[PDB]
Amino acid sequence: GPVRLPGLAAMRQGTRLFTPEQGEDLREALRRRRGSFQTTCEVTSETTFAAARRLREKASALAALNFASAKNPEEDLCRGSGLYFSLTSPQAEPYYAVNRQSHSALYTDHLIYSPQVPIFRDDAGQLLPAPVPVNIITAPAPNAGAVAQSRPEQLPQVLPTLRERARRVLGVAAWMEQTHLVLGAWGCGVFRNDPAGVARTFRELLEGEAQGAFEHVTFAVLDNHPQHPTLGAFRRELESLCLP
């Protein structure tokens, strides 16, 4: 029969959906991990997968945040990886079905956890000699641009939606015992969330509820714009977390 391609079945079968009603269990998992580590934080000018590939030898419990679409499984972490084979798993289907029927550009607090997704290619699109597996957390940031255009009365709700969903990202990471996280400018760019505000949201959590819950947090923010405004905003906001 068909050749079994390495690791793809285990990734798909191990994919996990987190639903809104699991918020409290996620909060408890994060609370138990709080204070475990003297967290190291850094803000780097790297792509998400370049950071994951650099760190994957340093740690196996490494997870990256995928800046995902809410409705369909400009580029997310499916590019260069096996992630689509996980996001289309049957257990992940409610993430797409519920977000579609919500009809809200704030979306819902569904998250997908994808274990040991193979990274197949580098930043330039060339094949890696050996794929590099990383865990991936998929959750959509609120689409501030779409809220502003089509439901402006929801615009004051973008910040609390972003914070509560960021809290659940960290909670999923703690729930799956992840020690290393690759975060970044989640929802910035096309969704038009402000970079300083996204950085400040993660700062609030990492200096509070999630303080010491992770060994290492990398904010991978590749920015080649002349004034580096996105990378600069993250560095300015997260300065106090980044001091060695």
Residue numbers in the entry: 27 to 99, 111 to 281
Sentences from the paper on this structure:
To determine the mechanistic basis of DrPARG-mediated ADP-ribose modification, we here solve crystal structures of DrPARG in the absence and presence of ADP-ribose. Eleven residues (GGGFLGGAQAQ) from position 100 to 110 in the apo-form structure of DrPARG, belonging to the catalytic loop of glycohydrolase, that were not well defined in the electron density maps were omitted. Upon ADP-ribose binding, as compared with the apo-form structure, that of DrPARG changes significantly. As compared with the apo-form structure, the bound form structure of DrPARG showed additional secondary structures: a short β-strand (denoted β4′) following β4, extension of β5, and an α-helix (denoted α4′) preceding α4. Consistent with the thermal denaturation study, structural analysis showed that in the bound form structure, the induced α4′ helix formed more intra-molecular hydrogen bonds, especially with residues from the loop connecting β3 and α4′, whereas the equivalent region of the apo-form structure formed fewer hydrogen bonds with surrounding residues. The presence of inducible secondary structures observed from the comparison of apo- and bound-form structures confirms that conformational changes occur during ADP-ribose binding to DrPARG.
Despite the abundance of PARP1, most of the PAR generated by DNA damage is rapidly degraded, with a half-life of less than 1 min by poly (ADP-ribose) glycohydrolase (PARG). From observing the structural peculiarities of DrPARG, we show that although previously thought to be an obligate exo-glycohydrolase, bacterial PARG could exert both exo- and endo-glycohydrolase functions.
